[PDB]
Request: fold
Amino acid sequence: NKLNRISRQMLQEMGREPTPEELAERMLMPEDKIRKVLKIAKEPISMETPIGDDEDSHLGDFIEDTTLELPLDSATTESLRAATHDVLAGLTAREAKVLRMR
Amino acid sequence: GITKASLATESFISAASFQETTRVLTEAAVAGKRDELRGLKENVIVGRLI
Amino acid sequence: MVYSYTEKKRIRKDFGKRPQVLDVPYLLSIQLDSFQKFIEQDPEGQYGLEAAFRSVFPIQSYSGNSELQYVSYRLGEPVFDVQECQIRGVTYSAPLRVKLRLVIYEREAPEGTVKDIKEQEVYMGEIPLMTDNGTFVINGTERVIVSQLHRSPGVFFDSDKGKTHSSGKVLYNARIIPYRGSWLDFEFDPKDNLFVRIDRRRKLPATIILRALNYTTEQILDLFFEKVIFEIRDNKLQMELVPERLRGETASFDIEANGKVYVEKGRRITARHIRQLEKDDVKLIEVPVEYIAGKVVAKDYIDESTGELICAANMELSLDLLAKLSQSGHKRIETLFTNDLDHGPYISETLRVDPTNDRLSALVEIYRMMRPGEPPTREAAESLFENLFFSEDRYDLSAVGRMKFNRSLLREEIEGSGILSKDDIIDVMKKLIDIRNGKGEVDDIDHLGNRRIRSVGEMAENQFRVGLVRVERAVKERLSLGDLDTLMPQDMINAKPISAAVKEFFGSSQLSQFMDQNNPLSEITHKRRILALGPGGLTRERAGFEVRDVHPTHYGRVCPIETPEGPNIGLINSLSVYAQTNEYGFLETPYRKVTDGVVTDEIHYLSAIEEGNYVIAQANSNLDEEGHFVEDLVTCRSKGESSLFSRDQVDYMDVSTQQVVSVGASLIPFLEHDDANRALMGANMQRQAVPTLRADKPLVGTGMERAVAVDSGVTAVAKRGGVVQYVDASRIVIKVNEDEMYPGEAGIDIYNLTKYTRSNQNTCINQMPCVSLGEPVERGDVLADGPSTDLGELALGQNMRVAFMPWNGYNFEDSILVSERVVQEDRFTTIHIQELACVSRDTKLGPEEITADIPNVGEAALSKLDESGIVYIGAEVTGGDILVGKVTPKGETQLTPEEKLLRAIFGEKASDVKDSSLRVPNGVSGTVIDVQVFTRDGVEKDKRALEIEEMQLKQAKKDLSEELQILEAGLFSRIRAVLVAGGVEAEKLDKLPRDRWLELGLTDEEKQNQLEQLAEQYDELKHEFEKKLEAKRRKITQGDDLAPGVLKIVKVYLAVKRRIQPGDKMAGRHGNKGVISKINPIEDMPYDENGTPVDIVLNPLGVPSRMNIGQILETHLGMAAKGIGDKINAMLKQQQEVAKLREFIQRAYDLGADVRQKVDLSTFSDEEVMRLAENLRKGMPIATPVFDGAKEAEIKELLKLGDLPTSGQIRLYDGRTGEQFERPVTVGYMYMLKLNHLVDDKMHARSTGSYSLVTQQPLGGKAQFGGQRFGEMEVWALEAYGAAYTLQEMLTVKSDDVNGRTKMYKNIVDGNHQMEPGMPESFNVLLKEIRSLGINIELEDE
Amino acid sequence: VPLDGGRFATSDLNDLYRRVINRNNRLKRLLDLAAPDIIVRNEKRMLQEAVDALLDNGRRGRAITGSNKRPLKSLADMIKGKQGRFRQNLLGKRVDYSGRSVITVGPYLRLHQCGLPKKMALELFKPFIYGKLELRGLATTIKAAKKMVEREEAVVWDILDEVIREHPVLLNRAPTLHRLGIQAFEPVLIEGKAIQLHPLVCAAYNADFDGDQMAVHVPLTLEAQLEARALMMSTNNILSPANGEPIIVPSQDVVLGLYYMTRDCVNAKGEGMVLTGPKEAERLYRSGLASLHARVKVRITEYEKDANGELVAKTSLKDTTVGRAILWMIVPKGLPYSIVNQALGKKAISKMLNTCYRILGLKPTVIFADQIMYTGFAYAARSGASVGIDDMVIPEKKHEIISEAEAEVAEIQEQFQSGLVTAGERYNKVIDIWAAANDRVSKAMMDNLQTETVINRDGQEEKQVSFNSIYMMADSGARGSAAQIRQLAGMRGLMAKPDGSIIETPITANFREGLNVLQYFISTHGARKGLADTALKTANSGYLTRRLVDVA
Ligand SMILES: [Mg+2]
Reply:
């Protein structure tokens, strides 16, 4: 709220708008916190916000899953087991045991 | 008529598709209607062999 | 006039007869004019920023007698200019500085001010600015606001026959549509009861408003009905008779007066009986007491003695009721005049359905209609009714509304109050009833007199007005409590409120859209465009075919054949060639006034309603000498139709043969020969032509292309005439002629040319100089061509040799078979400029680095990058190359046992930073033409970014210095000239240093004062240079403002050069599409006896079905054109002489008889003629006017001069077998465009990409596009076939199953083709949504 | 879930769910505080309103989401939509292993295959390529295989030819109507980014080449390969399911070839001679001795299977032309020579394929169909057919007909000035005379255009059906029709003003001549209503199919 107040007068007082670091000296705190504070203060945007064409395409329809694992990768994991398991059968039983242990 | 006869379908999942969903779901949910699939539309929704 | 300098370079041969009386005005007129009126200082209420201010101002507080008025405004210089505003991404705008005056009246006045503080130009907002080309830059992007077409404000009377009630009988309804404020609707019903509804709200009986206007019933009856006087004189009922009242009625009793019986009972009263009464002047007759049984009493009547109401007004009298009012002493009883044919008894029956009685009741019943459910209040009802149509704030018709209103009511004043008056409503009701009565007609919405055209200026005014009202509430709110002298007109007026109203319009609005710039025609045809959609318009779903169709009023105003083909047809159209917005805002077109029997060349602009009654002749007509019509009757149109009209009847005549069409349609040659469907598509596709690498010229043409090139800003036009001092591929400096030069500063005009840069469509827009060192140029000449323009004409493509013949099916449907010669000549090649960006943001895990240190990349990868991590300028790149190195923190990787062993063996340290670096998209390859680095203020600019900043500084200094050097020399060169007058010393003057020249004076004369003038302006430039340099330097060094979270952004610019390949779309102007099928060697190309192959082989089968015959004519004449070229190409290789060439060229430009072209021997016989011939050797440019175009005979005649056959067909030989081809085939030159559908855009393929989070489904996240969408119809297609497994795999494993997909992939590499489908995640999610409600859904049994 | 720039985005349900909790919680608090009735009641109502908004919003107040005017979408609205359940409504879920691009011709193709862009096939079959690369040992492991195809090493191209060979692909167009909208083809590796599509199939897809795009789908599972090959394969649907007539009927260029092939002029090189068989007939033609169309007797051997499951053979001297003799080489076995002995228009050329199917079965008809296309394109190219401006012949009597028809209107007009005929009767009358005139001009240019080739064999004169290009197009069935031809040469129609009436001053000119200002302006309505009507009737048609497939 305190930030809004300064931004009000300084909007027309400065004729442009106070620079991102302008309200910072006016405010008590370390003043680089404006960026951090200004970010968390924003309200999240509705995931159903229609964008473009008026079509059923909605913002949420464009958000990809980043926590999944691509199969072209998962395939290489299942193979690498067979790989290290094969190459560990090529050694002496104690070298295989010692490396499987370490 | 075609649009009237298509209204009545034993499978509610099929009816829930092209008709008004709310009315179909309610009207089915009260009677405890048991959809056996057996049709095309319903099997496509559930994702098994036609 | 009588021919320019770039016309001496090349001249287009023009067939056609009709002289052009008027020439095409500025085609961008509307766009520029509109915004020019919006932002301007106008000392009156004429539309503009002044008017929107004068409406809401002055703003006074609530009763506090503290008023804030408005003085004047100004627009500060733009923060960034167009170029800088485009690069940085900000909006091109000017600060609006407005002086406000705050007056405070002494409390408990007589009104006088304690103090009035004038706040100097308080700043509110930055309003966007329009480019010299009529475009806006919102965020770094050129955007155009399309002019709008809506329903004109005023009154409109409709029918609604048919569908209603299915009884016929029609209906008659009136609608008052204000520019702002609520709607007032009047409508009838099958019972002839007049109804009213405000906006779309509940229906209400019409009369309920009259009571709300403070009208008692007696005055309502007195207003809408006439008075039938009944006299009781002596005893028993005499009556006054106006002899005309008996028309349309049959005698109900013995009609007798004046001792003579005029009509008996049962004899209808015709005009003859009426004549007798009129001529015998019978005022009073005797009537029976039973006739008033139906007659409705006019006013109230009471009993004088008992003071009791005998009968209320508007009540049906009876024989008994007459008795009870008779004994009370009443001589006169007024009744209504009612006739079911002429004057209808409607209003009378409307009162019986009226629930109200008095004014407050009606106001209550209206207020309870508008705001129902809440208790009504007197002040509330009064406030609402006065605020709807009577308040200057909430209601305006403005000028157009009031004018059409008054005009449609047959009033005098064309201008009046902007609100409604009681006289107005009453009058409107009278007109509606008059139409139902049979006198008068209903209008139609589709007429162009009721369709008004807005444009950027008008719309911007409305939005600023909305800004002023939402600021108004605030100003009053603060002035409520205000302290006297502390606050001033600064603390009150804010910026963001006003700035955000206007910003929300230009940024996102249905009328604000990206300019279509792939092409000059596309731009100019976009900037002239009309829309009936958007805010305040109808919608595609809402409105039917009535408004979409072409109307007779469209002539000369809206182009019939240029409109989009699709969801909205006829909802767009385009503006015509000569059309102009009327003074009042309608559409008016040029015409020629025919007085008596002569056709006068005075031009006259007629609006849609103005043109109606006059009889207008035809654009194609034969007149001669004095301009008398040759034929005794000529085809003309007068009122909505066309027929033969007599010699001297016609009031006017069409100005040109073109004016019916639009710039798009006017560029199609032989348009009169093409079916309208294909012509539409032609003018529709003509806008999609991407410019080419080598600008060619159209060989077949119209003659508008010259005008289109200049009027559109793509080219560079001479400001003033003179001789070119300097010509570079960068700039052009012109030395002004003294007649055109202003006295002070002397001068030269310096044109800074645009070089290779990104367009909106990702094409290349690049200017090239068309003039040579030391050449005379005249004002209004093309200095440099833009993209797709050649020597002042408009070239959207390249004409080429085409053969019509089936070639081994490779041309099958529309398919085009193109020789390899074309791709080798690189003529259809296109240059694309794509802007790729790399953003370094801030995450909670840490800041992202642009550093060049990237985990797991070889020396070959890091080669093309500098020390800083940005690719060098000019390095050619392909797919996979790293444009900008970027790395983002992701900590504690959490590896697994076998990955840990892998690193153990190979000893690699897995980084704490992950690689986000921007790499070139798959398959696209080009050369880097530029790099920009924007950095957040306070983060240290890296090495490369500093080099660029230092580079830009030096480059800026060089440019400004170049300016100052040429400028100063140009000025001192004038001082040299003025000193030589009055004191000439030639060799003496240029010896001493030039700086010391300013000391030498002159004898008393104006020449002494001229040296003074040049002195003043010199030093100004010296200082203007200084201040300009400082600002540029500061603009370079200033840290650009970025989005929240982004630390720095690196934008790389790649210029890809694509030529032509199978899959590209190609079409002529005639609506014949095609997609190149095979690129055939020159060896297999059909060739003629001379051995010259053909570039393209078209399939003839496309010509008859789709009727475009122009494409054949364009070919024929085209061939002929090339002939005249080839001939000249031989005579230039012969080097005959100026005489021989001149003869042949003259021969071509005449061509046998009666054309308007004229020609030479005024031209210098050597240097000017030889240059023209050199430009014609490629081909002889021909101009076919739209409907005035050439004729078969002329084409065949030009073919005789060509040496080529009349048939236009020759023998061709297959380049494969070498044997002849049976029958002759048509060969010629067709202009062909390359549209950008290009096959390496459309082409997409995906194996396994990213997936959507909300529903697991294929989605492109890398620009590796998500898979194709399999729809309902495709499912049915699989269902008709017996394929179950294809369908299951389609909607389960290939898409929606988060398990089945991976279990499938592992099987595909293992070599086992199976599917372990599982349940699609969509349905599995649907279960939870149902289960999220009170519904238990289970999967039973087993 | 978070976004770039540190901003967050979330579903509307949270805003709703949050509310239901708060008020609920508040109510619980309000119980332990012993609040007055008027409050806990209001709180109960508020809780009721909040739950309603969560379940189905819009049946009471339509609550709006935070900071955004647009009402927040509730669970009933998540299921609901257009229409009903998007989970398999249009449209319709995204699918892997697919692609798309502009399509081109490729006339060389057999009917069972299609040209596939190299890059498309690489990115599409990526897992198969990976699996195949290490089955033969060209790649050490799956990763190395990825690196190989990502490097595009020259060796991978041959492995792709293996995995493509027997592995059908599904092709689809934008407006899928009947089952032929998707057909299976055999991939043929093709350089370039454009899809090549067999010409004979262009009829079933209703796919022009004017820039229409098609989509490809890979049939992954084995059952899909055998479904595509045994059901969705191109060669297995040669006949429309709507009616047994072949939908693979040759379209335009091919039928103009065969029309020009079997046709006869009056006098031509090789007229009257005799040849042993089609082999030396083609040898006569290709060498340039004999013309493609000339009346000639040649010995042919036709076949009739009219025995019991057994092909009879019979040889005779048939009176035919050179083209029909050459064409006979294609006709397999038991078809009689009578089928090719005619002029072979588009109608007869279809029943040829039809009879061939109903007699010899499936396999012979396929190879037959291919051959017809190949020979059609080739010979059509030899023919050198074209269209010039002089190919459209206007009647010499046109202006005179217009004048006579122009007298009728002035006759009837004089009758209206004198009141002999009523206004309405006049309109019909004038309109009637103009209509008759149109028929006259149409049936004039039709006679002239059709037969006017007048030529000489050994005598003075004779006249046959014209060899003029545009007539051959219209006669064969390739393209154009008497209506469209009539608009080219003879006058075109009487247009109609928007209200539906028809203007009594028709278009007296045509496309070969110029149209003036008025005629084009009047023509505009027909165009605009045509485009509008088709674009609307297109939508109407689709809706009908919906109701139909729903009811069945
Ligand atoms: Mg198409």
